[PDB]
Design an enzyme around this catalytic site. Structure first.
Site, PDB file in Angstrom:
ATOM      1  N   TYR A  10      38.646  25.812  64.080  1.00  0.00           N
ATOM      2  CA  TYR A  10      38.101  25.643  62.693  1.00  0.00           C
ATOM      3  C   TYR A  10      39.455  25.943  61.663  1.00  0.00           C
ATOM      4  O   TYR A  10      39.831  25.241  60.843  1.00  0.00           O
ATOM      5  CB  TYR A  10      37.140  26.636  62.166  1.00  0.00           C
ATOM      6  N   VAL A  11      40.501  26.793  62.021  1.00  0.00           N
ATOM      7  CA  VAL A  11      41.583  26.974  61.498  1.00  0.00           C
ATOM      8  C   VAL A  11      42.807  25.940  61.944  1.00  0.00           C
ATOM      9  O   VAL A  11      43.521  25.467  61.084  1.00  0.00           O
ATOM     10  CB  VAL A  11      42.101  28.209  61.701  1.00  0.00           C
ATOM     11  N   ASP A  30      45.664  22.859  73.083  1.00  0.00           N
ATOM     12  CA  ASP A  30      44.506  23.588  73.312  1.00  0.00           C
ATOM     13  C   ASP A  30      44.236  23.755  74.709  1.00  0.00           C
ATOM     14  O   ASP A  30      44.720  22.699  75.535  1.00  0.00           O
ATOM     15  CB  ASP A  30      43.120  23.119  72.520  1.00  0.00           C
ATOM     16  N   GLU A 161      35.499  27.987  55.699  1.00  0.00           N
ATOM     17  CA  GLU A 161      35.089  26.878  56.019  1.00  0.00           C
ATOM     18  C   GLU A 161      34.293  26.131  55.055  1.00  0.00           C
ATOM     19  O   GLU A 161      33.548  26.858  54.410  1.00  0.00           O
ATOM     20  CB  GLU A 161      34.173  27.250  57.487  1.00  0.00           C
ATOM     21  N   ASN A 225      23.733  42.022  46.838  1.00  0.00           N
ATOM     22  CA  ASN A 225      22.488  41.999  47.548  1.00  0.00           C
ATOM     23  C   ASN A 225      21.665  43.266  47.294  1.00  0.00           C
ATOM     24  O   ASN A 225      20.499  43.385  47.064  1.00  0.00           O
ATOM     25  CB  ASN A 225      22.568  41.730  49.021  1.00  0.00           C
ATOM     26  N   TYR A 257      39.965  50.288  38.608  1.00  0.00           N
ATOM     27  CA  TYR A 257      39.226  50.837  39.442  1.00  0.00           C
ATOM     28  C   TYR A 257      39.734  50.601  41.002  1.00  0.00           C
ATOM     29  O   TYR A 257      39.287  51.161  42.112  1.00  0.00           O
ATOM     30  CB  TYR A 257      37.652  50.629  39.691  1.00  0.00           C
ATOM     31  N   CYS A 268      29.466  60.315  34.095  1.00  0.00           N
ATOM     32  CA  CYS A 268      28.661  58.955  34.214  1.00  0.00           C
ATOM     33  C   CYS A 268      28.519  58.317  35.621  1.00  0.00           C
ATOM     34  O   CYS A 268      27.721  58.047  36.010  1.00  0.00           O
ATOM     35  CB  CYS A 268      29.495  57.890  33.108  1.00  0.00           C
ATOM     36  N   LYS A 324      40.141  62.960  33.970  1.00  0.00           N
ATOM     37  CA  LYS A 324      41.149  61.835  33.822  1.00  0.00           C
ATOM     38  C   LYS A 324      42.037  62.483  32.902  1.00  0.00           C
ATOM     39  O   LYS A 324      41.721  63.365  32.147  1.00  0.00           O
ATOM     40  CB  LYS A 324      40.378  60.597  33.058  1.00  0.00           C
TER      41      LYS A 324
HETATM   42  N1  LIG Z   1      40.989  56.213  42.903  1.00  0.00           N
HETATM   43  C1  LIG Z   1      40.789  55.739  41.904  1.00  0.00           C
HETATM   44  N2  LIG Z   1      39.819  56.353  40.889  1.00  0.00           N
HETATM   45  C2  LIG Z   1      39.867  55.669  39.492  1.00  0.00           C
HETATM   46  C3  LIG Z   1      40.546  54.254  39.294  1.00  0.00           C
HETATM   47  N3  LIG Z   1      40.180  54.064  38.001  1.00  0.00           N
HETATM   48  C4  LIG Z   1      39.414  55.234  37.458  1.00  0.00           C
HETATM   49  N4  LIG Z   1      39.128  56.043  38.402  1.00  0.00           N
HETATM   50  C5  LIG Z   1      38.136  57.216  38.264  1.00  0.00           C
HETATM   51  O1  LIG Z   1      36.759  56.882  37.923  1.00  0.00           O
HETATM   52  C6  LIG Z   1      36.405  57.791  37.105  1.00  0.00           C
HETATM   53  C7  LIG Z   1      35.828  57.335  35.824  1.00  0.00           C
HETATM   54  O2  LIG Z   1      36.761  56.799  34.876  1.00  0.00           O
HETATM   55  P1  LIG Z   1      36.537  55.774  33.885  1.00  0.00           P
HETATM   56  O3  LIG Z   1      35.417  54.794  34.392  1.00  0.00           O
HETATM   57  O4  LIG Z   1      37.943  55.242  33.403  1.00  0.00           O
HETATM   58  O5  LIG Z   1      35.951  56.633  32.756  1.00  0.00           O
HETATM   59  P2  LIG Z   1      34.398  57.247  32.339  1.00  0.00           P
HETATM   60  O6  LIG Z   1      33.637  58.021  33.142  1.00  0.00           O
HETATM   61  O7  LIG Z   1      34.580  57.662  30.799  1.00  0.00           O
HETATM   62  O8  LIG Z   1      33.694  55.623  32.181  1.00  0.00           O
HETATM   63  C8  LIG Z   1      32.657  55.002  32.777  1.00  0.00           C
HETATM   64  O9  LIG Z   1      31.487  55.521  32.407  1.00  0.00           O
HETATM   65  C9  LIG Z   1      31.094  54.970  30.892  1.00  0.00           C
HETATM   66  C10 LIG Z   1      29.975  55.573  30.559  1.00  0.00           C
HETATM   67  O10 LIG Z   1      28.903  55.355  31.273  1.00  0.00           O
HETATM   68  O11 LIG Z   1      29.720  55.907  29.604  1.00  0.00           O
HETATM   69  C11 LIG Z   1      31.335  53.535  30.928  1.00  0.00           C
HETATM   70  O12 LIG Z   1      30.843  53.274  29.948  1.00  0.00           O
HETATM   71  C12 LIG Z   1      32.506  53.232  31.327  1.00  0.00           C
HETATM   72  O13 LIG Z   1      32.521  52.007  31.324  1.00  0.00           O
HETATM   73  C13 LIG Z   1      32.610  53.594  32.668  1.00  0.00           C
HETATM   74  O14 LIG Z   1      32.133  52.961  33.501  1.00  0.00           O
HETATM   75  C14 LIG Z   1      37.358  58.817  36.925  1.00  0.00           C
HETATM   76  O15 LIG Z   1      37.166  59.756  37.854  1.00  0.00           O
HETATM   77  C15 LIG Z   1      38.507  58.149  37.414  1.00  0.00           C
HETATM   78  O16 LIG Z   1      39.362  58.795  37.597  1.00  0.00           O
HETATM   79  C16 LIG Z   1      41.206  54.059  40.355  1.00  0.00           C
HETATM   80  O17 LIG Z   1      41.969  52.698  40.240  1.00  0.00           O
HETATM   81  N5  LIG Z   1      41.306  54.313  41.460  1.00  0.00           N
HETATM   82  N1  LIG Z   2      24.754  36.823  49.486  1.00  0.00           N
HETATM   83  C1  LIG Z   2      26.041  36.150  49.104  1.00  0.00           C
HETATM   84  N2  LIG Z   2      26.537  35.795  50.042  1.00  0.00           N
HETATM   85  C2  LIG Z   2      27.573  35.023  50.107  1.00  0.00           C
HETATM   86  C3  LIG Z   2      28.180  34.632  48.519  1.00  0.00           C
HETATM   87  N3  LIG Z   2      29.475  34.085  49.082  1.00  0.00           N
HETATM   88  C4  LIG Z   2      29.648  33.781  50.219  1.00  0.00           C
HETATM   89  N4  LIG Z   2      28.707  34.461  50.688  1.00  0.00           N
HETATM   90  C5  LIG Z   2      28.462  34.542  52.362  1.00  0.00           C
HETATM   91  O1  LIG Z   2      29.717  34.920  52.697  1.00  0.00           O
HETATM   92  C6  LIG Z   2      30.016  34.592  53.994  1.00  0.00           C
HETATM   93  C7  LIG Z   2      31.126  34.061  54.272  1.00  0.00           C
HETATM   94  O2  LIG Z   2      31.573  32.779  53.489  1.00  0.00           O
HETATM   95  P1  LIG Z   2      32.994  32.411  53.009  1.00  0.00           P
HETATM   96  O3  LIG Z   2      33.908  33.583  52.779  1.00  0.00           O
HETATM   97  O4  LIG Z   2      32.790  31.414  51.847  1.00  0.00           O
HETATM   98  O5  LIG Z   2      33.462  31.554  54.378  1.00  0.00           O
HETATM   99  P2  LIG Z   2      34.434  32.029  55.685  1.00  0.00           P
HETATM  100  O6  LIG Z   2      33.991  32.675  56.414  1.00  0.00           O
HETATM  101  O7  LIG Z   2      34.485  30.574  56.269  1.00  0.00           O
HETATM  102  O8  LIG Z   2      35.997  32.430  55.067  1.00  0.00           O
HETATM  103  C8  LIG Z   2      36.122  34.097  54.688  1.00  0.00           C
HETATM  104  O9  LIG Z   2      36.922  34.277  56.066  1.00  0.00           O
HETATM  105  C9  LIG Z   2      38.030  33.557  56.144  1.00  0.00           C
HETATM  106  C10 LIG Z   2      38.780  33.730  57.312  1.00  0.00           C
HETATM  107  O10 LIG Z   2      39.006  35.004  57.846  1.00  0.00           O
HETATM  108  O11 LIG Z   2      39.254  33.072  58.006  1.00  0.00           O
HETATM  109  C11 LIG Z   2      38.753  33.854  55.143  1.00  0.00           C
HETATM  110  O12 LIG Z   2      39.973  33.187  55.122  1.00  0.00           O
HETATM  111  C12 LIG Z   2      38.151  33.408  53.892  1.00  0.00           C
HETATM  112  O13 LIG Z   2      38.861  33.797  52.855  1.00  0.00           O
HETATM  113  C13 LIG Z   2      36.984  34.181  53.768  1.00  0.00           C
HETATM  114  O14 LIG Z   2      37.040  35.270  53.440  1.00  0.00           O
HETATM  115  C14 LIG Z   2      29.161  33.506  54.310  1.00  0.00           C
HETATM  116  O15 LIG Z   2      28.039  34.103  54.958  1.00  0.00           O
HETATM  117  C15 LIG Z   2      28.437  33.220  52.875  1.00  0.00           C
HETATM  118  O16 LIG Z   2      27.588  32.557  52.979  1.00  0.00           O
HETATM  119  C16 LIG Z   2      27.571  35.377  47.451  1.00  0.00           C
HETATM  120  O17 LIG Z   2      28.150  35.152  46.409  1.00  0.00           O
HETATM  121  N5  LIG Z   2      26.363  35.868  47.768  1.00  0.00           N
END
Ligand SMILES: Nc1nc2c(ncn2[C@@H]2O[C@H](COP(=O)(O)OP(=O)(O)O[C@H]3O[C@H](C(=O)O)[C@@H](O)[C@H](O)[C@@H]3O)[C@@H](O)[C@H]2O)c(=O)[nH]1
Ligand SMILES: Nc1nc2c(ncn2[C@@H]2O[C@H](COP(=O)(O)OP(=O)(O)O[C@H]3O[C@H](C(=O)O)[C@@H](O)[C@H](O)[C@@H]3O)[C@@H](O)[C@H]2O)c(=O)[nH]1
Ligand SMILES: NC(=O)c1ccc[n+]([C@@H]2O[C@H](COP(=O)([O-])OP(=O)(O)OC[C@H]3O[C@@H](n4cnc5c(N)ncnc54)[C@H](O)[C@@H]3O)[C@@H](O)[C@H]2O)c1
Ligand SMILES: NC(=O)c1ccc[n+]([C@@H]2O[C@H](COP(=O)([O-])OP(=O)(O)OC[C@H]3O[C@@H](n4cnc5c(N)ncnc54)[C@H](O)[C@@H]3O)[C@@H](O)[C@H]2O)c1
Lengths: 436, 436
Positions: A10-11, A30, A161, A225, A257, A268, A324
């Site tokens: 396929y690839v 092949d 695919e 899902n 995140y 939260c 934070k």
């Molecule tokens: N490891 C890692 N940790 C992260 C990252 N970004 C954020 N965090 C952590 O995720 C936690 C939450 O941070 P953030 O979502 O910025 O702040 P907050 O908890 O205030 O806001 C979330 O809750 C709000 C709410 O329910 O009131 C939401 O409204 C809001 O949007 C956030 O989802 C913190 O512990 C962070 O340190 C990252 O890239 N990597």
């Molecule tokens: N429930 C749900 N299922 C999904 C969704 N989108 C895709 N699927 C399923 O995700 C599975 C993989 O589909 P897809 O990523 O479109 O095809 P493929 O497996 O050929 O490609 C992936 O593997 C390739 C590879 O390693 O060769 C990657 O290169 C490629 O990028 C994909 O990540 C399939 O079972 C899909 O039905 C969605 O939004 N919702």
């Protein structure tokens, strides 16, 4: 360019047609006579929109052919792409069987060939595979050295695919894993025309990027899902919910995140994960991935502890306490949990957090700080330079810019434990990252 | 507009400041005199950039005030925003204590009010809360009914601590859970000026969106952390890896993979999740979230089976068999898994798949189909109309556009099970969705 492609599945069949279309001389290789027969007849061995036409054009122009003669294919090409299968063994590990035979075959073929050959692995393989399996095998069968006598690289595929040709012509990005510069430049030249970034990395980084992409895709599906199952159970359209989540490109569908680091906390995220999973449970909705988040989160706190206590010293300076940087909020702070673990195990802890210090004397959460967690807050030190000077292990707990200078100009005799990502590079004897 | 805000914590204090800065006359209500006294002094109870200045401005224009007198607050405002806490009970469930109290207060306060008042819940609460807890309490305490007498809605917030003001000023979106149109229109006017969509949905959908966003954020962090841990163990920088993943806005940081639906399959996603998790285990890297994907995935196949076998009939027509529409690839197809489960339990199965049928005649997969999966392939029917005519339960398994007609113009006497999202609306007596 003269290109051989090992594996016309396929690839590989797609790469053969796509490269053929772009003007290269392509020899498909092949073990399956049937696959070779179809290609030479210009027929698609699989259902993939547009592939037949391309195979057709490749034969008509005389640029595309197939054979089982791997020795001849190598002899008459400058670069060989490995696109054979890497299926699961019974235990879930990858089966390198096919990769290994092609590596042997290629090795023996360049043994007699004096011109510099180049081998590129397109097949998805675990990190370490090229360095510990591909190279030793090719070197052993050829009697020549990797990088020097033959080029070696990896070039992971991102094609899906059913849209494989469009994905080839319009990729998100091109990733190249490189050892010798020449192979990297070779791959760069092949993909130069595409409207996407070319990202060149070490082979191990390239291999890790590919796996991470696929597992992310799997994680996204699983998340949708599970959310979906919960929505249905409460009488709502899961597609409708996911549709609006997908309208947010600031937080949801962005890089926010996505930095590897420390556990999440605050009032939260933990609370809402717990409530939503509790509701799902009440409604008899299975949710393994959502139900694993809190455990993974608490594991990350333990991992930090493990790093900090691995240094044969009890003197720890914790830089950051609030969940934070930029806020004084301590609710479900992982840094507070970390602090309590350390105190519990007898560590001599000093803590710096300018916001929590400020709040301790000015604000509405003074009671909690002075009365609920005095055992932690009493360890606050107003001066950063004092926490640093008196501690052996310094842990960068949250993202205060005040800690940059410490990281780039670290005093002697300290051990840094970076939970945030301040370090410019990877772990050394003086500084270690939680994920680097 | 005149607005009362109940709860001046991290959320309400910001809303009070931001609303007053926009010309609204705001009255903040809290049970804590400490918070109330500080707001009247134009002082922030928490550390949150720019809040003090916003609070002082409110004081200096006479627009912002604070009090414990909720009756007066309700009497002197057109709408009350509920921004009180909703922390975890010991068991993880949502604690509604503070919400309930505020609801009784407002209800009582409302019993008197001559003009129609509007109640808007900003606090994060589970689906079912407004209809099963908030409305009853208010209605029963006011002596009024929801909708006709007093307005009711939800308006979740997406502000992050430390950047709450900026987030308020430039949100990803505004979400409104509406009951009566008047409330919804009211919220629309308040948020009209914001440069972001206003999304009005039912109360249940609204709350489900909020929970989904937060649990999504937690899942992102957890994913990055687990990948980071694996990266570190294999000797690479996890942030460098995640950095490249984030350069892909086609598949990684897009809505692709985020539709709720059926299990994932094919020859890459399952294999790669299994290989990565196997390697992580070998490296002593715990990975609860990544380790739960395959189980969630097999659960989703079971769920579809459960839906199908619930109709007291053995005549099943499966529309789609390959892992994806547009390809003939059968490797680790969840549709094949489903078929085998139905066969094992004795169902009378007919299967339609254009691409697999074609491959049975042209292509290099004739073997697997004719000799590896005969018990399934022998159930293939080349005519879609015959599959429909002869079956009682029709399963929409993959996204072939040929299946649209059947969904829009379903013949009488058929039960549809939609695994992909063809249905325009939600589950009915004649058509059911896996996540709707
Ligand atoms: N490891 C890692 N940790 C992260 C990252 N970004 C954020 N965090 C952590 O995720 C936690 C939450 O941070 P953030 O979502 O910025 O702040 P907050 O908890 O205030 O806001 C979330 O809750 C709000 C709410 O329910 O009131 C939401 O409204 C809001 O949007 C956030 O989802 C913190 O512990 C962070 O340190 C990252 O890239 N990597
Ligand atoms: N429930 C749900 N299922 C999904 C969704 N989108 C895709 N699927 C399923 O995700 C599975 C993989 O589909 P897809 O990523 O479109 O095809 P493929 O497996 O050929 O490609 C992936 O593997 C390739 C590879 O390693 O060769 C990657 O290169 C490629 O990028 C994909 O990540 C399939 O079972 C899909 O039905 C969605 O939004 N919702
Ligand atoms: C991606 O890319 C890779 C290929 O996947 P795919 O879906 O195309 O798999 P596929 O199974 O469809 O194709 C693999 C092909 O490689 C062939 N092959 C096996 N040994 C060979 C050898 N010695 N020389 C030449 N060809 C050989 C097989 O016959 C088969 O045609 C995998 O690693 C996957 O992760
Ligand atoms: C979001 O927003 C909501 C609030 O979060 P937060 O972090 O700002 O919470 P918080 O704890 O920071 O603030 C909530 C406020 O509500 C107040 N409160 C509790 N019961 C009250 C009542 N009976 N009447 C008036 N005020 C009352 C508390 O004193 C507190 O000031 C949560 O649902 C969260 O999920």
């Amino acid at each position: 360019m003269r290109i051989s492609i090992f594996g016309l599945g396929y690839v590989g069949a797609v790469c053969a047609g796509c490269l053929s279309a772009r003007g290269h001389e392509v020899i498909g290789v092949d073990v399956s006579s049937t696959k070779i027969d179809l290609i030479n007849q210009g027929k698609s061995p699989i259902v993939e929109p547009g592939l037949e036409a391309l195979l057709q054009q490749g034969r008509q122009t005389g640029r595309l052919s197939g054979t089982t003669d791997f020795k001849k294919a190598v002899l008459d090409s400058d670069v060989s792409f490995i696109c054979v299968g890497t299926p699961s063994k019974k235990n879930g590990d990858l089966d390198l069987g096919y990769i290994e035979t092609v590596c042997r075959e290629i090795g023996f073929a360049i043994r007699e060939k004096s011109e510099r050959h180049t081998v590129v692995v397109r097949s998805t393989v675990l990190p370490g595979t090229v360095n510990n399996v591909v190279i030793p095998l090719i070197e052993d069968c050829s009697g020549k050295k990797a990088g020097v006598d033959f080029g070696v690289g990896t070039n992971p595929e991102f094609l899906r695919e059913s849209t494989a040709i469009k994905d080839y012509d319009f990729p998100p990005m091109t990733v190249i894993g490189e050892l010798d510069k020449q192979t990297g430049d070779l791959l760069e030249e092949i993909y130069r025309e595409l409207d996407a970034p070319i990202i060149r990395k070490t082979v191990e980084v390239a291999e890790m990027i590919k796996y991470t992409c696929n597992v992310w895709h799997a994680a996204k599906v699983t998340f949708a899902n599970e959310i979906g199952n919960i929505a249905k159970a409460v009488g709502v359209d899961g597609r409708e919910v996911m549709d609006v989540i997908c309208q947010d490109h600031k937080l949801n569908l962005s890089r926010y995140y996505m930095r590897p680091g420390f556990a999440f906390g605050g009032s939260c995220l933990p609370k809402d994960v717990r409530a939503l999973t509790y509701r799902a449970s009440q409604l008899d909705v299975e949710h393994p991935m959502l139900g694993s988040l809190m455990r993974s989160n608490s594991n990350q706190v333990q991992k930090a502890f493990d790093l900090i206590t691995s240094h044969d010293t009890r003197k720890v300076g914790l830089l950051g306490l609030s969940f934070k940087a930029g806020t004084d909020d301590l609710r479900e702070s992982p840094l507070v949990e970390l602090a309590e673990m350390l105190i519990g195990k007898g560590y001599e802890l000093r803590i710096f957090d300018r916001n929590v210090e400020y709040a301790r004397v000015h604000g509405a959460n003074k009671e909690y700080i002075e009365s609920k967690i005095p055992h932690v807050s009493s360890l606050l030190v107003s001066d950063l330079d004092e926490v640093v000077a008196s501690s052996d292990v310094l842990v960068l707990g949250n993202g205060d810019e005040l800690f940059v200078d410490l990281v780039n100009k670290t005093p002697s005799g300290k051990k840094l434990v970076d939970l945030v990502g301040f370090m410019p590079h990877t772990t050394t004897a003086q500084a270690e990252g939680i994920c680097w």
